[PDB]
């Protein structure tokens, strides 16, 4: 799938690619042209995402994401161009479909013991968590800021299985830069809180804050037990 | 987009050297074929400008729209000498034009990292609606004003965004130079609301101009850390 | 039984040819194909094999289960490519299989007179004996490696078999290499005792190698008789 | 498969020549054309593969391995004149993928018994090796750093191979060759280290250096018993 | 690529009579046509550049750099002639140009392995690095200045890299010259600096300077190895 | 087939024509189209040795071959002309090409009974033998050094078979020629063993010259048979 | 197929028109107009025979060979001016081909019953077998007078074929000038033999001598049956 993969990777740059002449050819048609191959590319993408995880490629998988997630940004990034509430809608939709393509990744290289491509399909989920508030800004979407903070809450669940994972492998460089996206997780929870005015997402926020110094101990207990 | 860019400045001097001597020679004819060379020239410093983002070079991409601007000024210089309101219009269309071409330039900078660019761009911007304010007063167009007001007002805000990007790279004589772009905007904005008779631009420009105090604060701030 | 033999003979030819442009093509799906012909093959070759047991063609039936063995071989080449624990199993399966129906061969060759056919069997067997260890070896089973074990002891009485025959017809040629296949399992024996970490599995080694010597002894005796 | 591999020859020529006109042009539309047509040149010289090895021929199917990795090296040099990330990520793919097919034609060698296209098979993995630590440093990606660390490493264990086949071959020239290679990889490992900063890194070239005398003790054996 | 660079060389001297005629004559006609033919003989040379680098001649390439250089010069003495601010821009692009083509040129020269093309090459950037200063100080420019000072400190690092060069082929001469360059150029950084009144400048000209002695050492070294 | 081949010879002719015209013009592009128009009418040629096959006449297929020998020739004169690696191996390429197009007419003159076609068949692969060794030193290509030797000496082999045909036709003249050009070989073998400094390629030069003795003295009895 | 005739008849003299002219004018170019035009003319010579054949008028089939041997002089004698080898290659394969071609005429005559353009048709063949000669004297091809030994060889049996068809018809006049026909190759024989050094060749021409004598007898036998 390696191959499938590459070729769906064209697509996306050819996406990107689009946009740019778009923007500057002033082109509502080079736009919709696109919106059309951006998710073209991230559904190819899911098709290789299958193919991997029937091969048991894990760093694949992975990358067939990332690719879904870039699309997710392009999409966002033509929705602004074009002015269009449908584009926005679209990438609300492949933004929120690629952290749960990377949460497979992730059961993928749990499976496989690979707790280098567990991290990055985390990390990924929280670079949608963060596409999902951007995405939300501009619909100005009380759902869609919904659908982000609940995306971001489950990042930080998914950052802590990572951790587990390097801890069972006694890889403390992963362990620490788990935590790290459980953090991150927690500002975007904030700056979500504060865009849709939620006080109770204002806790959630808190509650993975904490929860972060917590499993940055674990990392340490992981470092003196490693060296 | 070197060889684009030096063809397309050809063409912006030709259409100058075009003026000159219809003014000298008093032809009507001459000075359709500056207005016909000025026009050209700007729209193929934005297929340059094209060239130049997709290529990511700022510097080709800010002169290009400098090219745009000394079209928009030439068009102006042009409608004054053959007495066109057609042309007066022409070069409004441009001059907005090439501020909102600068602000992708502006964009491009921020992404590369380049203040200097960036500064100049938003420079540019702040030409442009100097260049509105004159073709307005030419025209006798309120709207042309209006235009004028949005630009320069936009120009501050766009200053104001190369500052962050001047503090993060520690360049305070950037930071100072974007603060000196909205001090000229302020003053814009006030002979603007005086062309115009607004007092709610004469507000904007009171605005702009206590801003421009608080944005040199920052600036010293800057220059402290920096030394 | 003849035209049955080279029809599936073009079956296995085939799936291995469906291998070979699954590698380069790098397709999941060939890969599928090709064990399911495989496979196929391999049942179609024992439907010939019975044929052959009711004619009374002791090659055919040889030749008919080496067709299986070469099935055996290519579903463990294809498990490997695809990544497959079921191909896998599916490997061990049929080569485990293969060795019992060569034992069928080796009874009819027996009761034909074919000391010739009679060693073939037993050869099948070994390279049967050795294709369960390497399947074992890539799925990481212990019961494989039992399986393995197994079949490999009993390829050596299956040769001490051989070697009565060919005692009785005369033939110290086949005599002779009867005993190279049980020097052949005897090495098995030992390969498979050190990736089972078996004991015991190394006694048995060590048994059939003291009997091949035994048997090699006979091997003289025969051929002095011969001449 | 001889033509055909001709062919896809001239295909990489002529990517090499749009990439030396685009250059002289300055043409970023000609720099797009050198990459379709060196990207196409590698898929159809896997394809040629494909052919080789199913034709019996190492010394094509070698060759159009060796296409394929001028292509990435094609690639990298066309994505430095283009400024292109895509371009480069499209380099780190088929340069990757040079290596693993390097792999399959080092397979083809071995059991061809030509531990000269064996050798040269390998050759080309560390060549790939090197260029993707070329990729990484102008793509600053630490997991093309990573990809370049497995594969040169992987290359000294397929040098190794290459050892084995030149051994049993009697042929202490290849075998010499193979450990020069080796040693190449050692170089690339620390210089990976260096890049990526890993101490790890740094064990692993320590590790096939030491590695690399072992082999040339082995090699000094060889000669010894070829005189 | 020798005819083609003979006839650029011819319009390069016509550019030159021209000047000349149109000073003793006074006409702004003739500067015009100067001012065309210049540009064109750089542009054609730009073409024999690439010719030359197709054939693998770095003479030719050179020497057609070496024209465009020329032309700059010429340019600029026209644009003063003439009191062309358009002219000084035109000059100022080629100016840069130039040393941007000699940078090709010295690419070629080292994969030639010829020191004494590649030295000449920097050369020619020395002396557009001088000629940049020139223009930024008759046109009034402190892009210009900027410019030049971009350009000079590269000349330096290009400087090096002939050191290299000259290092490798033994060559003590070229090497010693090499050093002289990077001298001329921390003249020439000063000089800007002063110009442009940047202390940053006046620092990297410090620095320059100080390389050129370390270089220099180099350069020792080299001759006691040589003799 | 006759039509056709010389339809191809004319091809032939005018790439050589394009040759001597590009030398004389100096002409980059003119020597491209000389390689195309040379390869095209070398593949050509071979379509023609098919029909030359399939209609029986090994004349026609004979000189079909001697215009891909008369290619290659030429793809050599062109590339060092041009200066061309791409171009050389182009040559290399056909210049094998030949020598096994070659074969296959010996084999039809065998078939036929005609020891002259097959007899100037072997020369056009001592022909390519030498072209290889002057292709090798031009591109400095040890692989082609080898291909050269590897040729050369099947050739001689070529020429063995030529003179058991001409014996069994009883034509001396035919069988004095064919160990001419097997002493030809034992020339090339050396030289091309002087310029590989292989001592095994030397020992193959020394055993073919020893066996065109041997050959001779075949040639001496044959003669006395005929008379 | 008449009007088809002549104006290939009008090429066939504009080709030698242009070589008149070319001689005069000393015209390379011309020469090479004059190759085309004779050759184009022999090739639409042959699309006419195939229309005369089909028509079945021996006349007009008779006439278009005839105009193809003018062509291979006319090929031979612009050659001769051009100093062509390739000229000279293309005359000898032309004048080849017209004696294929004027067996076919002779064929069809003979199926008509008219032995006038039977005997006319192997006339042509003469004719060839001369200019085969020719052709091989300027050119210096063995291989050249080889053909031109078969050609003329093969004219001698074509006649007495002729000689048949006059005595069945009656004509005692075609018949005497077939013999005639026959001793005129006989002296081209040995004019080949002389040239070529040929003892078989010699032979060959004292059996067609000695033919033309006993064909001369069959003649006198006609004549007395005729009256």
Redesign the interface.
């Known amino acids: ?3 499938e ?2 070729r769906v ?2 697509l996306v ?1 050819e996406a ?2 689009l946009l ?2 778009a ?3 002033g082109s509502e048609d080079d736009l919709q042209k696109a919106l059309r191959t951006a998710v073209e590319a991230a559904r190819e993408a899911v098709k290789v995402l299958l ?1 991997a995880v ?3 490629d894990p760093e694949v998988a992975l990358r067939a994401v990332e690719l879904v997630v870039r699309v997710a940004e392009l999409l966002l990034r033509i929705a602004k161009e074009s002015g269009s509430e449908l584009a926005l809608k679209m990438a609300l939709l492949v933004a929120e479909e690629a952290a749960r393509l990377a949460k497979i990744v992730l059961e993928l290289a749990e499976k496989q013991g690979d707790p280098e491509v567990a991290l990055r399909a985390v990390e990924l989920v929280v670079r949608v968590a963060e596409l999902l508030l951007r995405i939300a800004k501009e619909s100005g979407s009380e759902e869609a800021l919904e659908r982000a903070l609940r995306v971001a809450e489950e990042a930080a669940r998914l950052a802590k299985r990572v951790l587990e994972l390097a801890e069972k492998q006694g890889d403390p460089e992963v362990a620490r830069r788990a935590v790290e996206l459980v953090k991150r997780v927690a500002e975007l929870l904030e700056r979500i809180a504060r865009e849709s005015g939620s006080e109770e997402a204002k806790e959630r926020a808190e509650r993975v804050r904490e929860e972060a110094r917590e499993l940055q101990e674990r990392v340490k207990e992981l470092r003196e037990r490693e060296g």
Chains 1, 2, 3, 4, 5, 6, 7 share one sequence.
Do not use: A, Y
């Open positions: 799938p390696e191959v993969l590459l990777v064209m740059k990107e690619e740019t002449l923007v500057i050819k193919q029937k091969r048991g």
